[PDB]
C-alpha cells in the first residue's frame, strides 16, 4: 500500500510548492507596500508642518488686518 | 462573545462584545479602554476592513477571533494652539473633549503641567470642567496658551 | 522515500506557517498604507485651504497698504 501513499504525498507536495510560490510573490508585494506607507507618513508630516507655518503667517497677516482696518 | 484586538505595537486586555453590538460599539469599547478616539481606530477583520452600518455579525465576530487596529495619523478634528513662544502647534481633538484633556495634550507636546496653563479662546478663559463643544470651538479655531500666574 | 516525504513536509510546514503569519502582517500593512494615504490627503487638503486663506489676507493687505501709502 506504499505506492498509494507515495502518489498522495507527491500530489500534496505539488500543491505545497504551488502555495509557497504564490506566497513568496505576495511577500515581495509586502516590501514595496512598507516603503509606500513610510512615504505617505512622510508626506503627512511635511504637510502638517506646512499647515502650521501657514497658520502662523495667516494669523500675523490677520492681526495687521484688524489693527490697520480699525485704524484707517 | 469575549473578543480581542491586535494593535500597532500590539495590546490586549479585558474584553466582551455581542454579535448585536455595533462595529462602532467595539471601537467605542476601545476608546473607553485605551484612550484612543473612534476616528483613529482602524479596524480589520482578518485582512478585511470593518465598516460602518453593519453589526459585527455581518462579518462575523466569532468569539476568540483577532480583529486588528492600527492608528490613523490624525483624526477628524484638530485645533491650533498659539504657544508660549507664539508658534503654532496642532492638536487632535473631539467636541467631547474636556479642557482638562486638551491641557493634557498640550502638556504632551510642550511639557508644561496643566496646573500652570491658561487657555484663551475668543477673549475667554477656559475652565477645566467644560468642553470644546460648549465653547463653540470648531475646526481650526486658535487658542492662546498663557502661563496661569500670568508668567 | 517516505522518511523524505515526512521530513520535507515538516520543513515545508515550517515555511508555510511563517508564510501565513507574514500574510497576516502584510494584510495589516496594506490597511496601514491606505489609512496613511487617506490622512495625508486630508492634511494636504487642509494645508491647501489654509494656504488660500493666507493668500486672501495677503492680497487684501497688499492692496490696503498701497491704498494708504498712495493716499499719503
Swiss-Prot record, chain A:
<comment type="subunit">
    <text>Self-associates. Interacts with HD, GTF3A, TRAF3, TBK1 and MYO6. Interacts (via UBAN) with ubiquitinated TFRC. Interacts with active GTP-bound Rab8 (RAB8A and/or RAB8B). Interacts with TBC1D17. Binds to linear ubiquitin chains. Interacts with LC3 family members MAP1LC3A, MAP1LC3B, GABARAP, GABARAPL1 and GABARAPL2; OPTN phosphorylation increases the association (at least with MAP1LC3B). Interacts with RAB12; the interaction may be indirect. Interacts with TBK1; this interaction leads to the Golgi localization of TBK1 and its subsequent activation.</text>
</comment>
<protein>
    <recommendedName>
        <fullName>Optineurin</fullName>
    </recommendedName>
</protein>
<feature type="region of interest" description="Interaction with MYO6">
    <location>
        <begin position="1"/>
        <end position="72"/>
    </location>
</feature>
<comment type="function">
    <text>Plays an important role in the maintenance of the Golgi complex, in membrane trafficking, in exocytosis, through its interaction with myosin VI and Rab8. Links myosin VI to the Golgi complex and plays an important role in Golgi ribbon formation. Plays a role in the activation of innate immune response during viral infection. Mechanistically, recruits TBK1 at the Golgi apparatus, promoting its trans-phosphorylation after RLR or TLR3 stimulation. In turn, activated TBK1 phosphorylates its downstream partner IRF3 to produce IFN-beta. Plays a neuroprotective role in the eye and optic nerve.</text>
</comment>
<feature type="short sequence motif" description="UBAN">
    <location>
        <begin position="43"/>
        <end position="48"/>
    </location>
</feature>
Curated annotation (Swiss-Prot), chain B:
<protein>
    <recommendedName>
        <fullName>Polyubiquitin-C</fullName>
    </recommendedName>
</protein>
<feature type="site" description="Interacts with activating enzyme">
    <location>
        <position position="54"/>
    </location>
</feature>
<feature type="domain" description="Ubiquitin-like 1">
    <location>
        <begin position="1"/>
        <end position="76"/>
    </location>
</feature>
<feature type="cross-link" description="Glycyl lysine isopeptide (Lys-Gly) (interchain with G-Cter in ubiquitin)">
    <location>
        <position position="33"/>
    </location>
</feature>
<feature type="cross-link" description="Glycyl lysine isopeptide (Lys-Gly) (interchain with G-Cter in ubiquitin)">
    <location>
        <position position="48"/>
    </location>
</feature>
<feature type="modified residue" description="(Microbial infection) ADP-ribosylthreonine">
    <location>
        <position position="66"/>
    </location>
</feature>
<feature type="site" description="Essential for function">
    <location>
        <position position="68"/>
    </location>
</feature>
<feature type="modified residue" description="ADP-ribosylglycine">
    <location>
        <position position="76"/>
    </location>
</feature>
<feature type="cross-link" description="Glycyl lysine isopeptide (Gly-Lys) (interchain with K-? in acceptor proteins)">
    <location>
        <position position="76"/>
    </location>
</feature>
<feature type="cross-link" description="Glycyl lysine isopeptide (Lys-Gly) (interchain with G-Cter in ubiquitin)">
    <location>
        <position position="6"/>
    </location>
</feature>
<feature type="cross-link" description="Glycyl lysine isopeptide (Lys-Gly) (interchain with G-Cter in ubiquitin)">
    <location>
        <position position="11"/>
    </location>
</feature>
<feature type="cross-link" description="Glycyl lysine isopeptide (Lys-Gly) (interchain with G-Cter in ubiquitin)">
    <location>
        <position position="63"/>
    </location>
</feature>
<feature type="domain" description="Ubiquitin-like 2">
    <location>
        <begin position="77"/>
        <end position="151"/>
    </location>
</feature>
<comment type="similarity">
    <text>Belongs to the ubiquitin family.</text>
</comment>
<feature type="cross-link" description="Glycyl lysine isopeptide (Lys-Gly) (interchain with G-Cter in ubiquitin)">
    <location>
        <position position="29"/>
    </location>
</feature>
<feature type="modified residue" description="Phosphoserine; by PINK1">
    <location>
        <position position="65"/>
    </location>
</feature>
<feature type="site" description="Interacts with activating enzyme">
    <location>
        <position position="72"/>
    </location>
</feature>
<feature type="cross-link" description="Glycyl lysine isopeptide (Lys-Gly) (interchain with G-Cter in ubiquitin)">
    <location>
        <position position="27"/>
    </location>
</feature>
Amino acid at each position: 500500500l506504499a505506492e498509494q501513499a507515495l502518489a498522495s504525498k507527491q500530489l500534496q507536495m505539488d500543491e505545497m510548492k504551488q502555495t509557497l510560490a504564490k506566497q513568496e510573490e505576495d511577500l515581495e508585494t509586502m516590501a514595496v507596500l512598507r516603503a509606500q506607507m513610510e512615504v505617505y507618513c512622510s508626506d503627512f508630516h511635511a504637510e502638517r508642518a506646512a499647515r502650521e507655518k501657514i497658520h502662523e503667517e495667516k494669523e500675523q497677516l490677520a492681526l495687521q488686518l484688524a489693527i490697520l482696518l480699525k485704524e484707517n | 462573545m469575549q473578543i480581542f484586538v491586535k494593535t500597532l505595537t500590539g495590546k490586549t486586555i479585558t474584553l466582551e462584545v455581542e454579535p448585536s453590538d455595533t462595529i462602532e460599539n467595539v471601537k467605542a469599547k476601545i476608546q473607553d479602554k485605551e484612550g484612543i478616539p473612534p476616528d483613529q481606530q482602524r479596524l480589520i477583520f482578518a485582512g478585511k476592513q470593518l465598516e460602518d452600518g453593519r453589526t459585527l455579525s455581518d462579518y462575523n465576530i466569532q468569539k476568540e477571533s483577532t480583529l486588528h487596529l492600527v492608528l490613523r495619523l490624525r483624526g477628524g478634528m484638530q485645533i491650533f494652539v498659539k504657544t508660549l513662544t507664539g508658534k503654532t502647534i496642532t492638536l487632535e481633538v473631539e467636541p467631547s473633549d474636556t479642557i482638562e484633556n486638551v491641557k493634557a495634550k498640550i502638556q504632551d507636546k510642550e511639557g508644561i503641567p496643566p496646573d500652570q496653563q491658561r487657555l484663551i479662546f475668543a477673549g475667554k478663559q477656559l475652565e477645566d470642567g467644560r468642553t470644546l463643544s460648549d465653547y463653540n470651538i470648531q475646526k481650526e479655531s486658535t487658542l492662546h496658551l498663557v502661563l496661569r500666574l500670568r508668567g
